[PDB]
Every structure is written in C-alpha cells, then in structure tokens.
Amino acid sequence: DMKLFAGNATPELAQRIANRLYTSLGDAAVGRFSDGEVSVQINENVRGGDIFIIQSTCAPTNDNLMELVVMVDALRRASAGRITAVIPYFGYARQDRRVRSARVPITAKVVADFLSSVGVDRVLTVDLHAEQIQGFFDVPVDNVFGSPILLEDMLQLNLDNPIVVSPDIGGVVRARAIAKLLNDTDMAIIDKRRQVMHIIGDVAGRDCVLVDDMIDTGGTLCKAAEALKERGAKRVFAYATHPIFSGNAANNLRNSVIDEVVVCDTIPLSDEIKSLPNVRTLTLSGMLAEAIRRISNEESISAMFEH
Amino acid sequence: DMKLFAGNATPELAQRIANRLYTSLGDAAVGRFSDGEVSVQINENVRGGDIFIIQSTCAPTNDNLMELVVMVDALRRASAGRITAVIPYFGYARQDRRVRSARVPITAKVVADFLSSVGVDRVLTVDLHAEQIQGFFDVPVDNVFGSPILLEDMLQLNLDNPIVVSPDIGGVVRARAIAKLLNDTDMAIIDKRRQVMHIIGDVAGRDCVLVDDMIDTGGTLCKAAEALKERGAKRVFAYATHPIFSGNAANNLRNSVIDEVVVCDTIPLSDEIKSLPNVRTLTLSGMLAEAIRRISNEESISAMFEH
Amino acid sequence: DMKLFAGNATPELAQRIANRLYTSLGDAAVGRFSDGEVSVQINENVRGGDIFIIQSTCAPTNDNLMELVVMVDALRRASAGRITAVIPYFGYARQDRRVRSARVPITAKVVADFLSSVGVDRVLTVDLHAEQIQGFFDVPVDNVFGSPILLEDMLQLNLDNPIVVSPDIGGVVRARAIAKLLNDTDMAIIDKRRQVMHIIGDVAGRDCVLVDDMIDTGGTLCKAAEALKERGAKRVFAYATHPIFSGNAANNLRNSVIDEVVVCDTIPLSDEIKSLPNVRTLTLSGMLAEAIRRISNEESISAMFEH
Amino acid sequence: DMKLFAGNATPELAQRIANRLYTSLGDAAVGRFSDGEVSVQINENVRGGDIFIIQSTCAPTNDNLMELVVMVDALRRASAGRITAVIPYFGYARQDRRVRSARVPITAKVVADFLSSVGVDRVLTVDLHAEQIQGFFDVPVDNVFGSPILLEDMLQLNLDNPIVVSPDIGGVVRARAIAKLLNDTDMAIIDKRRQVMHIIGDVAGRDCVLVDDMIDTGGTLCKAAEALKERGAKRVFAYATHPIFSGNAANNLRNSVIDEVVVCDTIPLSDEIKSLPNVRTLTLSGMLAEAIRRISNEESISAMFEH
Amino acid sequence: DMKLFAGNATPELAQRIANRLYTSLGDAAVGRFSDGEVSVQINENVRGGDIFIIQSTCAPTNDNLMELVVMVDALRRASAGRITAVIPYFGYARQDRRVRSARVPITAKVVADFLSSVGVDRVLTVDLHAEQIQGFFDVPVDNVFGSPILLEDMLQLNLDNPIVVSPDIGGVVRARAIAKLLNDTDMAIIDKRRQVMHIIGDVAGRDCVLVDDMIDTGGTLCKAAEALKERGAKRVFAYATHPIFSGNAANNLRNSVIDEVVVCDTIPLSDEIKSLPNVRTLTLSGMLAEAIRRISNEESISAMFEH
Amino acid sequence: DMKLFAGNATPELAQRIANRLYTSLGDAAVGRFSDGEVSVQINENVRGGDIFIIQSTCAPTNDNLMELVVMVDALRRASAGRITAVIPYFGYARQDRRVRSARVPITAKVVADFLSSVGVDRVLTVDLHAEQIQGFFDVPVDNVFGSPILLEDMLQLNLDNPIVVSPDIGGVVRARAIAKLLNDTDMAIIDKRRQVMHIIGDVAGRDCVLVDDMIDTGGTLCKAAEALKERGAKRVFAYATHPIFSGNAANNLRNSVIDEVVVCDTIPLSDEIKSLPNVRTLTLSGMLAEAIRRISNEESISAMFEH
Ligand SMILES: Nc1ncnc2c1ncn2[C@@H]1O[C@H](COP(=O)(O)O)[C@@H](O)[C@H]1O
Ligand SMILES: Nc1ncnc2c1ncn2[C@@H]1O[C@H](COP(=O)(O)O)[C@@H](O)[C@H]1O
Ligand SMILES: Nc1ncnc2c1ncn2[C@@H]1O[C@H](COP(=O)(O)O)[C@@H](O)[C@H]1O
Ligand SMILES: Nc1ncnc2c1ncn2[C@@H]1O[C@H](COP(=O)(O)O)[C@@H](O)[C@H]1O
Ligand SMILES: Nc1ncnc2c1ncn2[C@@H]1O[C@H](COP(=O)(O)O)[C@@H](O)[C@H]1O
Ligand SMILES: O=P(O)(O)OC[C@H]1O[C@H](O)[C@H](O)[C@@H]1O
Ligand SMILES: O=P(O)(O)OC[C@H]1O[C@H](O)[C@H](O)[C@@H]1O
Ligand SMILES: O=P(O)(O)OC[C@H]1O[C@H](O)[C@H](O)[C@@H]1O
Ligand SMILES: O=P(O)(O)OC[C@H]1O[C@H](O)[C@H](O)[C@@H]1O
Ligand SMILES: O=P(O)(O)OC[C@H]1O[C@H](O)[C@H](O)[C@@H]1O
Ligand SMILES: O=P(O)(O)OC[C@H]1O[C@H](O)[C@H](O)[C@@H]1O
Ligand SMILES: [Mg+2]
Ligand SMILES: [Mg+2]
Ligand SMILES: [Mg+2]
Ligand SMILES: [Mg+2]
Ligand SMILES: [Mg+2]
Ligand SMILES: [Mg+2]
Ligand SMILES: [Mg+2]
C-alpha cells in the first residue's frame, strides 16, 4: 500500500513523481495557522500503509523542516506502518563538524536526531554535501547521485577536448568522478589563497566544465569562471545539482562569463532566475520515481547507480 | 558560574533580566546564513558553567525554535555544565491532544522531545496554555503564573463591584483564580454555541474584567466584550499574559468597545500595536530575574507563587 | 490473529467483550504467589499474534497495574507481534501536574513510562481525566468518550426543560459537550469557595442533570445536589462514567437527595453499592468491542465518536 | 548534604539507621489516597542534595514498590542531585529467568527497568537471591552479605562439631561460604526427588546448622529439619536473612523440630511470629549505616565484606 | 524467507545446520583487511527477509564477537526484516557479577548491550553458564540444554550403578538434572578448600560420571578425576558441552586418569585434541536445526526440551 | 582528581604523557584470561574522580577495542565521575559510509555507539581520517591536528623551493593546509586511473613533500614517489601521522626511492621498521599532555591549534 504525501516545499516535483508512478498524491491539509505555526491534518486512512513523504528542506528552511517532522509525527500517531522520507535536498548539511573545536553546533546531526526521534524509518536523498551524513542516522540512508542526468546532458554538447574543473578543494571527488565518466578526460582544480586564485592543471585553449553540488550565491562559480577565462579557456559551462540561488545570485549570474548553467530540480526556481536566458533545468523525477518503486517492492537499490 | 545568553526573539527582555541580576549577557553570535539557515557561535568559555538561555518561541515561530535548539546543541558540545531554557512564551502549546482521534500531531510533545534530545536540563515558562505540558518533559518544568503582576495592576483601578469574566470555556480555571484573588468577587462565563453567545452569570451594571492567557487575533476577546456591553456592563477591561497579536489584531482592537487592554511583555510588540492608545504593557523582568536567581542558588522556587 | 487476555480486575467485562466479538478469552494463568507477588503464565502460542489485554487499573490499584505490566512483559518475551492494552479506567490519572512547583510526582507520566518500557504498542481508554495524557505516551492513544451511552439513557427520561450542571470547575468542558448533545439546553456550574457553594446560572424550577467523569467518595456530587435542591430544583440526576465508589460512598449516596445515579461498567460494583436502590448501571461492552474490532482490522477509529 | 527518607515498609529500621548516623529522617508525607493510590509529598528543599531512600519491597509488595518509584520520581522532579535506593530486601528477585522457555516474565528485570526509568543512580541491597541481578541494572549495585552478623551469632553457641546443611540445591554456595567461615567445617546438602529427601553427606550425631537466604513458608526448612532429625542429628538451628514468613509460616514453625530460628531485620515481623518463643532477631542497622556512610563520602565499599 | 549466514568461527557447524534444513548458506564475504580489521559485505538481497546468523564467540574471542556485531550492522542497514543470532557458545559469560563489589566489569552485560545496540531481535544459545544472562537482554533469549544428546550417549555405556559427580560447587544444578534423567541415580559433589578436595557422598566401587558445562584447561576435571580414583572409583567418564580446550588442555587430558571425554561441537576442535585417542565428539546440528525451524515458522519452542 | 590509566596498546606513550604531567599511571591490572578474553581489574579508589584512559585502537585492533570498552565499563560501575577516552589513533575510521548503497557496515558508527553505550563522556583523538566522525558521537570530540610537530620538523630541512604533493585525492585538504603553513608554497596532486598515475601540477626540478594521514602498506606512498621521480623531482620526503605499517610495508619502504619517512608515535613501531635506516619518529606526548591538562582544568582547548 504505497501512498505519497507532499509538503509545501516541492509540490510540483511531487506531482511529477506521482505521475511517473501512475498514482496520486494522498490527501493531507498542510498549512499555516494565523501566527505562522505549522498545521497538519491527514485526511485518509493510513493504518498499516507504506508512506512516502516528498519534501526538500529548502528555503524557507525552518518552516519546511518543521512541516516534515510534524507530518511524520501525525502519520506515526495515526498508526502508519513504515515511513520513508524522500528529501531531495537535505538542508543544513554544510554544518557537519567543528573545525578546530570551535564552539559551533553540528546541525546536520541535530536534524538527523530530530528525524530519528519523530519516527522516520528510511531516508532517501540526492547528492549529500558530505557522504558521511549517512552515518548520522540509525536508519538506512540511500544517497543517490545526480550525475547520470548531468552526464547525459554533457554528452550532448560536443565539446572540443573538454576539461573538468572543480571550483574549490571540496569538490575534487565529484569532479574526478565526472571526469572518469566523461570519456576519461583531464581534471583541473581551482585553489584560492589569502583573493588570488591558482589553477592546478592546464586549461589553455580547452572547453572547461565546472561541476559542483550546489550554487548558493554563485560567488565561487563566477570567480572560478573569471579565472578560467583569464587563463585562456574557450567556453565555460557550469553543472550543479541543487539550485539554491540565494542572495545576489541573479545579478552574479547575469554579469558573468559562464555560457550556460545547468541545474537539476531538487529546489524550485524563482521568477528572476527563470527570466535568465542562460540557466537551464533538468529533471530528477524519473530517477526518484524508480528509487521509490524499488524501495516499495523490496528490490535492490544498487541498480540506481548505473550510467 | 551563571551566564545568560539571548536569542533574537526577546533581546530587550533578556537585557532587562540581565540588568536586574547585575550581570551582562554572554557573548554569542546568533544570526542567519545567506539562505536563511540559523548560524550560532559561542564566543567565550562555558566549560562547567551554569547556562541560562532566554528566548520565547514567538513569531517567526520556527526560526526562533531552531535558534533555541541549535544554541543548546552548540553549548552542550562545548562542555557546558547545566543548561536551563527560560522560555517566557512556549509556542505550539495549543496543540496538546488529538480530539476524537483526528489524524493530527501533538506538536507540543514534539517540541518537548526535541528539547530533551538536544540536552536541556530544566525549563522555565510563564502561564502555559495547558498545565499538563509539564508532563511532556523528563526534566523539571517550572510553570510560573503571571497573575501577581496583573492583579497588582487590577487593584489600582478602583472598579465598582467588578465581576471577572472568562471569554471562553477553556479559561474558567484562570478566571476563578483571579476572582478569588480579587477580593473574592463573582464570576461569569461566556458560552458560544452553533454564532450566538450566552453568558452564564449576571453582568448587569457591573465593571467586567476579561482575563485570558493570550490574545492572538482578538476575535474571542472583542466578541465577548460586545456581548457584555449589549447585556449592559459599564466598563470592560481585558487582561492577558501573552501578546501574540497576529493577523487582523490591530484593526479588531481599534474598532472594539474594550476600554483598556493590559498585557505582559513575554512577546515584543509591533509598531501598529504600540501606536494604539488603549493597549498598555506590564513587565515580567523582575519575576523572571528572581526565578533565575533562585534556580541558580539551589533555593526553593515555591516563594515565586506568593501575592 | 486476534487474541484477548484478561486480568483479575475486570474479568466479567472482558467476558462480555469476548462474547460480542464471538471469540473466547485466551488461556493465561494470572494469580498471586504465597507472599502477594503477581504470578503470570501464558498457556498458548502467541508468536506473531495481535494481542489485546483488557484490564482497568482500579482498586486494588497497584496489584492491577503490576498484573498489567507483568502480562505485557511475559507476552513480549514470548515473541508476541503487537500488544494493545485496553484500559477502560486509567488509574493515577488525577496526578497530572505539579501545581505551584510542589514537590509531588506526576504519577500518570510514571505509569505511561512503565507501559512504554515493557513494550505496549497502543492504548485504548475511556474518558481520560485529562485529555493531555494522550501526550504522555509515544504510542497512539485512543480516548473514547462514554457520552453516547449516557446520552442515549438521558433521552429516555423525558425531563421537563432540563439543565446540565457540572459539580465543579474541572468538569465544565464535559458538561458543555453533554448540554450541546442534549437538544442544546442551558448549562450551570457549581463554584466552591473558602464551604459555601455558589451556582453560576439559573436552576429555579428545572430538572438538573449532574455530569461528571467519576464518583470517588460522592462528596462533590452529594454537596452539589444539596445546593441545587436548596436553590429550588425539581429533580436531580447524576451521570458519571467511572464508578470508583471508595471510602464512605455507600452512606453518602444513601443519605442524599439524588433521585437516580447512573454509571458505566468500567469498574465492577461492590455488594453494598449493588444493594442500593437508586444506583443503575449501563454497559460499555458494545462500544469497546467495536473499537477493538476496528483496531484489529486496520479500520478508521473516528466512527466511534458518532451519536 | 546527606538526607534520608523512609517509606512505609521499614520505618523502624530507617529510624535505627538514622540514629546510628546521628541524623534525622527527612520530612516527606508518604500515604494513601481514599481509593488506595500512593500519595507522596516532599516537604523540604532537596535541590542538589545527596538523597538516600530506605525501603524494602516486602509485603504488601506492589504498594511498597509503587511508593519507592513514586518517591524517586517526586525527588527527581524536585531537582535532587543523586538518588541512592537502599532496598534491604529486593522483592520479585526469585523470578530471574525463563526455565525451558516457558511463557513467564522475568519480573526482576522489569523492576530493575522501572527503577532505572524513574532515575535511580545507585542501588544497595542485602543478600540478593541471585547475584546476577547486579547485571540487570545500568547503575552500580552493591550486594552486601549478611553473613557477618549471622556468623558472629553462630560462634556464640558453642556447638559440638557442627555441620552446615543447605536445605536445597540452590543454597549450596551460601552454605559453603558459611562453612568456610565457621572454622572450616563439613557441609551436607538436602536433595529432594519425585517427596523423599536424600542427604548427601554424614549428619549422624552432629549439631546441624541450616542456612538459607529467606524463610517464606517454612516448608523446605521444616522438612529438612525433619529429615535431619530422622537421620539422627542432635540439634538443628536455622539461620536466614530475610524473614518473609508468609502463609502458614507461624503454624509450620510452631509444630516443628527446629530448636532455634535466627533471622535479620530486613522485613518487620508480625505479631504471631513475635509471639513464638524460638524465633530470634538480629539487626543490620549498623552494617547498613556504615555502607551508607561510605557511599556518601566517596570511600571504598570493599571494607564492608570483612569478618 | 529464511536465510542463513555464517561467520568464520563455526563454518562447518553452519554447513551441517544448513544441510539438515535443506537450504544453503547465504553469500556474504566476511574477512579481514590488511591490518586485522573485520571486513563484511553482503552479496545478495536481504530486504524484508528473516535472517539467521550462526557464530560462536569462541577463541579468538574478540575477532569473532566483532564479526558478529559488524554483520548484524551491515544486515540491518541493508533493510533486513528480522535478525536472529544463533550463538552456540556465548563467550564472556563467566563474568556475570561483581563479587564483593570488586572493581571489575560485568562483561556479559556489556556484550548483551552491544548486541541489543546493533539491532539483534532474538538470541538462541546452548547451555549458558548462568541462566540469568537471559535477563541481560531486552529481546527473547532461548537457552537450549544440550543434555538430550549427552544423555542419549550415556545410556549407551551400560554403566554398573553409576553415580553423577559435579566437579565443583557451581555445577550442582546441572549434575542434579542429569542424575534425575539417568534413571534417577545418586549424586556426589567435589568440594575444594584452602588444595585438598573433599567429596560429599559415597563413590566407593561405582562408575563415576563427571558432568560440566565447559572444559577450559581441564584443571578441575583432571583434579576431580584423581580424587575420585584415589577414593576408589572403578571408571570415570567426563561429559561436557563446550570444548574450549585452552592453554595446556592437551597435556592435562593426556596425562590423566579419565577413561573417556565426550563433548559437543559448539566449538571446533584443534589438531592436538583430535589426535587424542580418548576424546570423542557428539553433534548438535540436528537440535539447532529444529530450533531454527521452529523459530522461523512461529511454532512453539518448548518441544525442544523433551527427552 | 586527575587519574591516568593505560591499556596494552600504547603503554610507552602513556608513560611519556604521565611524565610530562608529573603524575603516575593509575594501578589497574589489564590482561588476558587463558582463552584470550580480556581481564580488567581496577586496583584503587576512583569514586568521583576524573579519569583519562589512553589507548589507541591499533593492531591487534579488536583486542585493543575490547580492552578499552571493558575498562570503561569497570570504571563506570566503580562510580567514576567523568571518563575521557584519549584515543590517539582511532581504528575502523576508514569505514565511514556506504558507497552506492553497497551492503557494507558503517563500522566507525558502530564503534562510536559502543563507546557511547559503555558510558564515555568525552573523546580526544589525533588526525581523524574523516572529520565528520565528530558527528558520530553524542559527546564532545576534540580532533587535534598533528601538523604542528610535522611542520616544525619540515622547516628544519632547508628544502629548495619545495612543493607539497598529496598521494591521492582524499588527502587534498590536508595537503593544502600544510602547503599554506609551509610558507605558502605550491601544491600538486597524484591522480590514479584505470594503473597509470597522472600528476596535476608541475613537479620538475623541485623537492617534493608527500603528506598523508597514515601509512598502512606503503602502496600509494611508494607508487607516488616513483611517479614523482620519473617526472623529475630532486628529493621526495614522506610525512605521515599514523604509522600502521601492515603487511609488506617493510619491504615496500626498503625497496623505494623515498629519501626519508617521518611519522608520529600514535602507534608503536615494530622491530623490522625500527631497523630501517630512513624511517624517523617524532613524538606527540607534549601535545597530548597539554590537551589533557586543558580538559582537566575547564580551560579552552582552542589554543591547541596554534603554530
Ligand atoms: N556522482 C558520483 N559518481 C560516482 N562517485 C561519486 C559521485 N560523487 C561522489 N562520488 C564518490 O567518489 C568515490 C568514487 O570511488 P570509485 O568507486 O573508486 O570511483 C566514492 O567515494 C563516491 O562516493
Ligand atoms: N463526551 C464528550 N463529547 C465531545 N467532546 C468532549 C467530550 N468530553 C470532552 N470533550 C472535549 O470537548 C471539546 C469539544 O469541542 P468541540 O469539537 O468544539 O465540541 C473537545 O476538546 C473534546 O475533547
Ligand atoms: N555470605 C557470603 N560470603 C561470601 N561469599 C558468598 C556469600 N554468599 C554468596 N557468596 C558467593 O560465594 C562465592 C565465594 O567465592 P570465594 O571468593 O572463592 O569464596 C562468591 O561467588 C560469592 O558471591
Ligand atoms: N540440562 C538440564 N536439564 C534440565 N534442567 C536444567 C539443565 N541444566 C540446568 N537446569 C536447571 O535445573 C532446574 C531444574 O528444575 P526442575 O524443573 O525442578 O527439574 C532449572 O532451574 C533448570 O534451568
Ligand atoms: N592539519 C590541518 N591544519 C589545518 N586544517 C586542517 C588540517 N587538516 C585538515 N584540515 C581542514 O582543512 C580546513 C581548513 O580550512 P581553513 O580554515 O579555511 O584553512 C578545515 O576543514 C580543517 O578541518
Ligand atoms: O555561494 P557559493 O559559496 O558560491 O556556493 C556554495 C558553495 O559552498 C560549498 O562549497 C558548496 O560546495 C558550494 O560550492
Ligand atoms: O485569536 P483568539 O482566538 O481570539 O485568541 C486566542 C484564544 O485561543 C485560546 O483559547 C486561547 O485561550 C485564546 O483565548
Ligand atoms: O470523591 P469526589 O471528590 O466527590 O469525586 C471525585 C472528583 O474528583 C475529580 O474532580 C473528579 O472529577 C471527581 O469529580
Ligand atoms: O517457603 P519456602 O519455599 O520453604 O522458602 C522459600 C525458599 O524458596 C527459595 O529457594 C529460597 O531459597 C527459600 O529457600
Ligand atoms: O579450566 P577449568 O577451570 O578446569 O574449566 C573451566 C571451569 O570454570 C567454570 O566453573 C566452568 O564451570 C568450568 O568447570
Ligand atoms: O596502504 P596504503 O593504501 O598505501 O595507505 C593507506 C592509505 O588509505 C587511505 O587513503 C589513507 O589515506 C592512506 O593513504
Ligand atoms: Mg564547494
Ligand atoms: Mg481561550
Ligand atoms: Mg471533578
Ligand atoms: Mg532455596
Ligand atoms: Mg560461575
Ligand atoms: Mg564449574
Ligand atoms: Mg589516502
């Protein structure tokens, strides 16, 4: 008995996933009270059922997170059988350690504990910022890579001896994976010091493909593109998974040298970003639908990592 | 080693409490990242100390709640000794049961579990909506009544044989307590059916004192005042503790028959409400300061319930 | 695989519930050792089954509570699948908070923690003293109102413009619900001060119906009846759900002015009470049987709250 | 800050322990409500203090156990620092396993879980039935042997080449320890089959000393004494620690051949037993007082096991 | 969906159990990394299945224990349904209490907590050293006696009025059970003091059968055999369940007077022990296979304790 | 009351740390029983004390881990106050996620759960393989970098325009940190594909400094050195923190082109490795002693990250 429920964060993606599964979204009234508190009511029998909740913890981050945990609590007191939380974009994931024992929280661990507390049985995400966040839960966590869609889109560009560049030091593993998949090309890395940006590798007269896991303000992306072009690269393409686009992202992308920015749909786009002419969107609904189908049927999930 | 920390919800109240304790607020940078996520950094040694955090979970409710739990987590990983959360207004407290086994959450229990999960050792609140929320925690919870301040203000009005009215059926216990304290006067109750409001009791030619625990939209308050005046009451005064004032509260209070509305300061007032000429504010900083002082010194807290 | 087990508290009610479900009580030897310790032995295979235990925590309260938790432990180590505890009368429910931070326990929370500790999966009660006790558990709790049976009995009295009276301030919500159900009549409330009892409302020349959730000693009930009659009420009927009848209840009811006392059967009656001529009993076996049937079949429980 | 509190089970022993510590019992009102429910109120400040509760879980077993857990809960919500439960006789300790996977509970584990749930920090008992019950807790458990007092009393009898006999197979380890302490004498064991009792060892013309951990009904004790005398033993003395004396114990001991029965005071004696001329009582107040003193002062507890 | 997995401790026994169940061992690669750390990989779909893991915690004890807990963790994150751990020999079981409050651990409780932590749902062992270790878990534990096989082997010896002897005081209960089963014969006990060994009972001119639960170094066994022969016993046979055989066991058994040593196969034998001519092995694969079959089918396990 | 205890893994390091703190190691007998099981006995009063246990989880990994958890359990049942585990080398840390949802365990999370289960209050490690393992605990974890000692040793080599190389893609962050500290030099990275090793960066005619966190078999290190020399580098130095040196490490290092290998002392060296002429050891005893001193005195730990 598979039922899908959606919050207010990604309703359109939840509709696409439901369409690809040939079912319909379950009836739940998820809204706000007068003072801003989350209101949830489940409007159908869920006893013994296998429930999936689809909601990214994107901006407004805290309201979306509260919607998620409150729906899980309402479902779990209504005697639901098993609850899987599909969270295409896992928010607060960049706060995953205390560097130099600074007096900061590990907020990803706090969110994982909240989800375990209200009674989630399984989590399914796309492109976690740190893969060790799989260990912040006591439940199985399936971290699905978004690279098949992006790679299928890259191979339709007919680049002239492309080189894969990671905009920073934290993206090197993902850049290397993409470089191996993209006919096993070269790789270069942007290193930032003091300000001045150094490039480790040769980018002279080649098409450069920047790959990252998110675009928040476009700062690192735009700066790396400027560095690549001023060391003589023909074209630069940016390829990310999570389109956060916060702050001054629209102006940063508009006044940039990036020829094309391609993102997935784990977060809905705003109006100013949709108005931009060089920002294009791929869809992850098929991949998420197949993962949900495999989880619901006691099937192996390893087939989801094939290209 | 008593240290006080404040969030962004009630900073001015935290300053008044610190002033009455002749100390200063501890240094912590509590803010937002670019995308709306809570940022916390403790900027001083808290090892082994006795920490108090002062923050109401008022609107914006979810951001304030996340600030609170994230500060508790950061303090607890920095090896703080004991953490007391002073929460003058406990949000989400109106969702405390499932009526008729409706498929709703018990969100107050969820919030209590989150606070117990991040490592709170003690909670101190003012005028909980339901006193049974004391049982939603495994830690001691001190629910301090705000009625001493309000009563001290009522006794300075020189009312002509006043009668204490509860605007609804849920406020009868608080109304009875106030009526006993206010020279042991009469009590009347507003009952709403179908629309039409019935008054149980005699209110003809008497000064009426409405008492409640919050004013959210002013709906029940304004309607009860209209009923009281159209059954012939001389003057009506409204006395509440938590000034939520959400939605159309300013217009409802402006176009009403209530002569004076008196509230406490557990939630900061907006500009439109401060502009109103018949809304007046009392302060709870002395009572909270004395409660914090008694908790810090291993002293009996029962003296806080004296009039 | 539905199996019913019964303790020693309410065996006759368990038999009626079994009869209405067309099954038989499971074989378990629940008794006492020589020194008063609870002895439990399950005498049949319960592996993977869906178990229901029917036992009120009525007097002797502590022996009944220990029987319940010990049966749950024996069933859970015998590899039972799911255990539902049907507790028609939830004892210790009047101790649900600490008033004025008095150094008392919250014993309802202690009992809820014990039940969660031995491994109960679901609780089903009738007319909880405080509905917030639903939040003292981490499991679903279904609090079924006994008002349908009592209302069906009230409507067969043909009262002359009846008025519904709550004997104290804590029963106002239940009295209001009954008043709405009983053709939407008036409501009056007994208020006790200092001794002297005040009645808020008009009771002159009307049939009065006192409604409460329990009758423990009959003190409040008898006193309220005396007040109602000495302000001129024609007849007084008392309507309760839980017949505790402790202490001097028999003498208090015998030497009273109440014309008829009607109770449910969540607690068995003693001999002295059955000898009384004006105490009558209704049965809840049909309602509990239907609730058990709906829980066992993954059906919606909301239909149980219909009149 | 050492404070002692006592329940209703062993108040006189608690007074003796307080006298030997030159302090007084703390003020707490522990009683019953009208219907038999436990009532507890702490009447003094216990914040930060080191609390000891002295109460055996003797008959009436369940009321005493509930008093204990309810006092612990009331103390723990009043912000007590550390709570030690001194339980001279640990009830329900004979139910410590499931023999042949019988569908019975392990009730000692249930009691240990309840004590850990309400927040006990340390347990101190005398002569546990099974020493592995130390492993049923997550807190330190100090199981103090009562054999020093009993041995000091045995050595004042001037027996003629005594032999130490265990009445059953479960008491062999304790009998061997006593035999080693009692000038390293011989040991014999009673074995019961089918009825007929076999004695392994030689008891002809010797003074026999039966040692056990409890006397519940006197069945095994009286039967073993009869067997010993009908295989020709001069005198038989019975030496136990816990005087349960339930059921027909008074008649069994009166119509027996045991010359003298000596017990400790972990359970108060009834009137019929005190009337018996050959039942004598030793006291454990000094040993328990010294153990409490050593626990309170961060001193080594190993000195308590010296003879 | 019953699947069997085996570790490296008892692979041959796991094969025999699989053969008697007419299935095959599941595919899992359990090995060591270069530095000695346990490596585990499950090579098949286990989603929703009912898993059994067969592995004794025998020498090397800590590597076997780590293999077990690591396999349980890998299975539980792969979404296995229910995990039963068949542990024919439970290691660390001799450390089950703190005698005289010595500063030692209770290591059996630590192992039980680890197994409960990684997510074991049920434990099945053979001949636990202390039966109270059943209470160290929160899950059902089935402690199956190995005495049927040993008794079936004893009855094929045609002994001349045999007597059953326990080599020490801790084995008396097991010796008594065997003596009752073996046509209800006599029993004698070895008592060790100061060195000198005393025998309680008559062993002159009888065949002696020593029964124990393990043979670790053969010290107690060889010494008891010497004592029995030097008080004139015709033949001595040793009967144990767990063949640990550590240290100098081979030399102790070779230079001994025991005519025949019979053991079960809960631990594999070494080469030096297999070379011995008077050490013989029985098999427990049929009994364990039937217990696994009964657990998998929701059948009563009590039939396993029949002779 | 600071007490230090040591296991058998790193006794000599524990002695150096004790010497720098001007105290002595506490008395505890930590050994093995006959069959290989861990034996622990604490031989002094530890009640209320602040305990530190110094032991790396190095090879033999599982015995060392069991020693650690068993000592923690023995200390915690002896009523120790606070227990800090100093684990200079955290074993099993390389298994920190499930790549592509492979059916493997996350063994670092299992070890963290075991340590939290037995009652550790704080962990202090050196150079964790993944810094997110800080989030696998609920207690504070201080991950101290070993780079100050290594950098102080590098600056005493007088290299000719050195370049810092990371032998693999996982070491890039550490290599970048060292490069910034080492007068802000260049950085190059070894990339391995299919076999063939690519170097991103220019290493022609420069002194190369390989930095890693461990040396297990020397495979990556020796291969990277060969690649660097066959692209023309003058000298190659290897700088690591944890000297695991397992398998064929001695032969790999002997038949290599690395001029000098410098390691810390978090793991003791074997004889074959000490015989090597180009392997040199630094000490971390001063840094660990200062960290222990700061933890014991409620001082800020951030001063430990200064160069
Ligand atoms: N999109 C991706 N595809 C494949 N591997 C990835 C990706 N993103 C990160 N990785 C990590 O890159 C590493 C690949 O290792 P390998 O299996 O040797 O290619 C693993 O740690 C993966 O978790
Ligand atoms: N017998 C009863 N029938 C209906 N409501 C009840 C009863 N007893 C208590 N209540 C409470 O009365 C309130 C009724 O609210 P409403 O839905 O507005 O009638 C809810 O809080 C119910 O939980
Ligand atoms: N009164 C007692 N005195 C000493 N040991 C006892 C007593 N009762 C039981 N025992 C147990 O007897 C055993 C004595 O072992 P040992 O130290 O060899 O004398 C331990 O297991 C003790 O726990
Ligand atoms: N092999 C065995 N067969 C039967 N009982 C055993 C065995 N080993 C230990 N026992 C214990 O011996 C006792 C037998 O009690 P009974 O049922 O009176 O024979 C129980 O406590 C059993 O757990
Ligand atoms: N030895 C080291 N010194 C400094 N940072 C390190 C070291 N090893 C790893 N790191 C990480 O490198 C990053 C340095 O960031 P930054 O503060 O910008 O230099 C942090 O994530 C550190 O945790
Ligand atoms: O706003 P930006 O910093 O440019 O983008 C967010 C980046 O912060 C993290 O490294 C992510 O990997 C992104 O690369
Ligand atoms: O917006 P309003 O409903 O008028 O005020 C909030 C009320 O809702 C609860 O009963 C509170 O007691 C208040 O009386
Ligand atoms: O013995 P009594 O106090 O008269 O009856 C018990 C009452 O105590 C509680 O308020 C219940 O609602 C009852 O009304
Ligand atoms: O009433 P009784 O059975 O004679 O005495 C209780 C006995 O039950 C247990 O074995 C105890 O050791 C006692 O010996
Ligand atoms: O090496 P051994 O001590 O002779 O054999 C192990 C014994 O230790 C325990 O009592 C077991 O019951 C065994 O009898
Ligand atoms: O035996 P090796 O693989 O050469 O050394 C262990 C390496 O495995 C991990 O990447 C560590 O960072 C090391 O670099
Ligand atoms: Mg980045
Ligand atoms: Mg209200
Ligand atoms: Mg009442
Ligand atoms: Mg006995
Ligand atoms: Mg033993
Ligand atoms: Mg033995
Ligand atoms: Mg590496």
Numbering used by the authors:
A (entry chain B), B (entry chain E), C (entry chain F), D (entry chain A), E (entry chain C), F (entry chain D): 3 to 196, 203 to 315
What does the paper say about this structure?
PRPP is synthesized by PRPP synthase (PRPS), which catalyzes the transfer of diphosphate from ATP to ribose-5-phosphate (R5P), thereby generating AMP and PRPP. Class I PRPP synthase is the most widely distributed in phylogeny, including E. coli and humans. Phosphate ion (Pi) is necessary to activate class I PRPS, while ADP, an allosteric inhibitor, competes with Pi and ATP at allosteric and active sites, respectively. In both models, PRPS hexamers are stacked in rows to form filamentous polymers.
Parallel to the two structures, we also solved another type A filament (type AAMP/ADP), which was formed under the conditions of AMP (2 mM)+ADP (2 mM). This structure is almost the same as the former type A filament model, but its allosteric site 2 is bound by AMP rather than ADP. In addition, the allosteric site 1 in type AAMP/ADP model is empty, supporting that the presence of ADP and Pi in the former type A filament model were due to spontaneous hydrolysis of ATP. According to our two type A filament models, the allosteric site 2 of E. coli PRPS may accommodate both AMP and ADP. The type AAMP/ADP filament model suggests that allosteric site 2 may favor AMP over ADP. Our model suggests that AMP/ADP at allosteric site 2 may contribute in the stabilization of the RF loop through the interaction between R102 and α-phosphate of ADP or AMP. Since the stabilization of the RF loop is expected to prevent ADP from entering allosteric site 1 and avoid the interference RF loop on ATP binding, we suspect that AMP/ADP at allosteric site 2 may enhance PRPS activity. The final average resolution of hexamer is estimated to be 2.6 Å.
